[PDB]
């Protein structure tokens, strides 16, 4: 009945600020952690419990840790508006960064900070009675996010065992780039994400920039817009635990319906009524129209085109004014289309969810206010095409050992490059083989 | 037909305080000792638990014993504490230290003579004496040592009366003390030789009664002691009120014990239900009998389903037909026939009393002799064997003076008790 | 627009009073500013009990 969030590095902490801003405003906790309640025992709710615990003085505090190796971003959280919301032990900061080296984070520096993080996560898990998963936010392009995220997922996987770990990951965009060494860190990261994650959602900033230019009317978007969209998606997926509805969906139902084989756990995400205020005046927003919207590739938050692959499973979460008969009519119409294809071994391709709470509006936001929305997470073979672009950049740089001396000097064997590159080749072949139609006797 | 009660140690003193509250309520005795009741039926048997002092007041025939006076100051501070005779409180000046040998040999022998003097003064005052009733824990220090010492001396001095004990024994799951297995083993060795009938209670079973059946939000030891006080006051109800089919402690013993060592029994009381649920189900003899045999309502961790009943007794309180009692007890004997020992043709005795406990129109208390009690003793013996093989804490007992041979004798006697129960528990087709 | 409650089938019509009865609802806190669709679990989970 609760979930714990782990935020790593710069992207993960900045996305965390938007997420906790939304969850506070949606439940109603004030910035100092106070919330009025009812004075008579028995007339009270519990929806906050998934994300907040209350102290005996009535302050609310959230189930999250913020991890960084440089102090600046955590000190910015400490001096901002939400200073009193977080417990000071939860905001953990080291002295110096991993300098874009996965090797520095994994072997030299994250090894010093990892035990404090594990002690805080243990102190959180002891204050729970129905923990049903970890949510992790990180980018695989940077040094501390890749190295410490991998090391921490390995340690969590040994200590907690069967408990689920769901990751939201900012992967390196296919042509927009921020640092030269991004391919090495992303390749070395993906091996750990392969072994130690139950479902992994992939995001690219280039797709969210395209989405904010095309659907919203923003000429100069910045990271706060992307982080607010990610927060809305996470709020939609976790709404099924927090509010009343016709068809609830527990986090184990996602894994049961969306994952066909234990390695095939990388999923695409999209959100339907991303629209500006001007458009709301001229657009109807029926169930079937937003269901048709979720399948347009212009709606995706990862730069991949699903028409180049086959769908294995789709999970559709409806929140707001929806009636099950309209969801059934929409899904039957989608199933009729010939540009939408499912693997022939998956005839019943859809999972549905219906919740009564409509999406919340944030004071500085850019999305319009709407009475209903649908969010989809889906598994498709097209994702194999996303890995190939990073692997080509790895082969280009590694042919001349362009920067390897940093990694070898900071403690890593050169063999790790070849192992990781072979593992990504095998993952690509797995997604090619699982997606092949039918078979033959010879 | 007068009963003398003995309460020893903190647990015993607390249960005794709750028992005397329940008994004083049923006979309408004010905490000042003045009779304020509303029917002559209350007066005609008041002698059974109270002696009469001059000018109306009544004082209860009980001896309070403990090795440290903290509990006695607590009971004197309690709501009914004033009723007790001042000369009846006997206490020492240092604690038992949770050690059986300390409670039995060194500080025990110093005080025991004053306790025997008070018990003899109380016994010789009765016109006709019925059995003694003793409450104590077996896991403690003064409770186990001085309780078994006093039981041995009273059994030497009054061998023709009845000796009845209610005893609480440490849970393997919810224990307060590390050296519990030694004290428990030595106490069970003393009881199987000394006792005439012994009832055993697990605090874990009373917690499961409170949490599952009564749905109490914040239970306390007072509730646990009320369940115990309810069964103890229920067993004696036919001794002190009229009824269609009278019963007595000796009659219970004669019908329950087939062979002299098999005298350990399980207890239950049927009408238990939470204040929210009580509006949804009326009490009736089929409902009381069904709850009465339900293991959820039994006060020990061992389950009857792993053994077989040799004998059982049910005492009913209230205005009811004899046909429903007879046909219900026949139906329960017929429906669960595999759990009843086949070489006894009918295992259940029934009894009916007209006056129910206050606030209930009817109630029943259940006493059962079942072989599943062997599982409790086996578990205690296992923990003892783990500790004894490694000499884990023996120097305390040996420093007090105990021979290790005492430990080997007590282990052998309990093992033979477990074997005797185990032969009768299982079927033999041959 | 940041504080008003959207008109739904499950909230009913506010200016006529009609409200359809459907499954999946729970008792409602009467405090101001709280959503009526927040989960209620006092009957099945007595919080802070022991």
């Amino acid at each position: 009945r609760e979930a714990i969030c782990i935020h790593i590095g710069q992207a993960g902490c900045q996305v965390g600020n938007a997420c906790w801003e939304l969850f506070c405003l949606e439940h109603g906790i004030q910035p100092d952690g106070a919330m009025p309640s009812d004075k008579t025992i028995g007339v009270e709710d519990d929806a906050f419990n998934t994300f907040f615990s209350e102290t005996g003085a009535g302050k609310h505090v959230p189930r999250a840790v913020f991890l960084d190796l440089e102090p600046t971003v955590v000190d910015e959280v400490r001096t901002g508006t939400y200073r009193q919301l977080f417990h000071p032990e939860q905001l953990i900061s080291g002295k110096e960064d991993a300098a874009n080296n996965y090797a520095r984070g994994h072997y030299t520096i994250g090894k010093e900070i990892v035990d404090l993080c594990l002690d805080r996560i243990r102190k959180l898990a002891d204050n729970c009675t129905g923990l049903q998963g970890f949510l992790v936010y990180h980018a695989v392009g940077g040094g501390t996010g890749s190295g410490l995220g991998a090391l921490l997922l390995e340690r969590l996987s040994v200590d907690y065992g069967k408990k689920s770990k769901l990751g939201y990951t900012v992967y390196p965009s296919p042509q927009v780039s921020t640092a030269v060494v991004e391919p090495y860190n992303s390749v070395l990261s993906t091996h750990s994400l392969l072994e130690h994650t139950d479902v992994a959602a992939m995001l690219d900033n280039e797709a969210i920039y395209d989405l904010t230019r095309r659907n919203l009317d923003i000429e100069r978007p910045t990271y706060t817009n992307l982080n607010r969209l990610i927060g809305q998606v996470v709020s939609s997926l976790t709404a099924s635990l927090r509010f009343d509805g016709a068809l609830n969906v527990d986090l184990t139902e996602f894994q049961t319906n969306l994952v066909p084989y234990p390695r095939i756990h990388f999923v695409l995400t999209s959100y339907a009524p991303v629209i500006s205020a001007e458009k709301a005046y001229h657009e109807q927003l029926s169930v079937s129209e937003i269901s048709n919207a979720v399948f347009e590739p212009a709606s995706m938050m990862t730069k991949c085109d699903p028409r180049h692959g086959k769908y294995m499973a789709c999970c559709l979460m409806y929140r707001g004014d929806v009636v099950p008969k309209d969801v059934n009519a929409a899904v039957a119409t989608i199933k009729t289309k010939r540009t939408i294809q499912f693997v022939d071994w998956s005839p019943t391709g859809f999972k549905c969810g219906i919740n009564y709470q409509p999406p919340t509006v944030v004071p500085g936001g850019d999305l319009a206010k709407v009475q209903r929305a649908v969010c989809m997470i889906a598994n498709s073979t097209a994702i194999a095409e996303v890995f190939a672009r990073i692997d080509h950049k790895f082969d280009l740089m590694y042919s001349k050992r362009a920067f390897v001396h940093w990694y070898v000097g900071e403690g890593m064997e050169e063999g790790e490059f070849s192992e990781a590159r072979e593992d990504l080749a095998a993952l690509e072949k797995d997604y090619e083989e699982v997606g092949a139609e039918s078979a033959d006797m010879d | 037909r007068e009963i003398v009660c003995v309460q020893a140690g903190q647990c015993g003193n607390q249960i005794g305080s709750k028992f005397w509250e329940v008994i004083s309520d049923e006979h309408g005795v004010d905490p000042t000792g003045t009779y304020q009741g509303d029917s002559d039926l209350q007066l005609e048997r008041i002698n059974v638990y109270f002696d009469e002092a001059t000018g109306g007041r009544y004082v209860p025939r009980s001896v309070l014993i403990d090795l440290e006076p903290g509990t006695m100051d607590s009971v004197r501070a309690g709501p009914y504490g004033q009723i007790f005779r001042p000369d009846n409180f006997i206490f020492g000046q240092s604690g038992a230290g949770n050690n059986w040998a300390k409670g039995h040999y060194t500080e025990g022998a110093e005080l025991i003579d004053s306790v025997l003097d008070v018990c003899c003064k109380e016994a010789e005052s009765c016109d006709c004496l019925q059995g003694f009733q003793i409450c104590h824990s077996l896991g403690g220090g003064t409770g186990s040592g001085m309780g078994t010492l006093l039981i041995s001396k009273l059994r030497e001095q009054y061998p023709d009366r009845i000796m009845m004990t209610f005893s609480i024994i440490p849970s393997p799951k919810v224990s307060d003390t590390v050296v519990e297995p030694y004290n428990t083993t030595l106490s069970v060795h003393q009881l199987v030789e000394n006792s005439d009938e012994s009832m055993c209670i697990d605090n874990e079973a009373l917690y499961d009664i409170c949490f599952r059946t009564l749905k109490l939000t914040t239970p306390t030891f007072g509730d646990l002691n009320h369940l115990v006080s309810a069964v103890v006051s229920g067993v004696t109800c036919c001794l002190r009120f009229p009824g269609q089919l009278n019963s007595d402690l000796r009659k219970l013993a004669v019908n329950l014990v087939p062979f002299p060592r098999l005298h350990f029994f399980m207890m239950g009381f049927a009408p238990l239900t939470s204040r929210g649920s009580q509006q949804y189900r009326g009490l009736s003899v089929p409902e009381l009998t069904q709850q009465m045999f339900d293991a959820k309502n039994m006060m020990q961790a061992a389950d009857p389903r792993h053994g077989r009943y040799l004998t059982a007794s049910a005492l009913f309180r209230g205005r009811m037909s004899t046909k429903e009692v007879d046909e219900q007890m026949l139906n329960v004997q017929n429906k669960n026939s595999s759990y009843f020992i086949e070489w006894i043709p009918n295992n259940i005795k029934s009894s009916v009393c007209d006056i129910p406990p206050k606030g209930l129109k009817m109630a029943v208390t259940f006493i059962g002799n079942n072989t599943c009690i062997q599982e409790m003793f086996r578990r205690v013996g296992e923990q003892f064997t783990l500790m004894f093989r490694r000499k884990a804490f023996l120097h305390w007992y040996t420093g007090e003076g105990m021979d290790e041979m005492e430990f080997t004798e007590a282990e052998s006697n309990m093992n033979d008790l477990v074997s005797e129960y185990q032969q009768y528990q299982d079927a033999t087709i041959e | 627009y940041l504080s008003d409650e959207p008109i739904t089938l499950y909230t009913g019509n506010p200016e006529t009073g009609c409200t359809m009865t459907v499954h999946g609802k729970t008792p409602v806190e009467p405090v101001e500013g709280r959503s009526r669709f927040g989960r209620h679990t006092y009957f099945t989970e007595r919080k802070y009990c022991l």
Partner: peptide, 26 residues
């Protein structure tokens, strides 16, 4: 008197522990 003070302390404790939340984290 000692008895009066002991009874008063016990009564106030019972009044405090009646609320489960206060028993847990007061």
């Amino acid at each position: 008197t000692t008895r009066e003070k002991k009874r008063l302390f016990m009564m106030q404790r019972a009044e405090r522990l009646k609320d489960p939340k206060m028993r847990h984290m007061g």
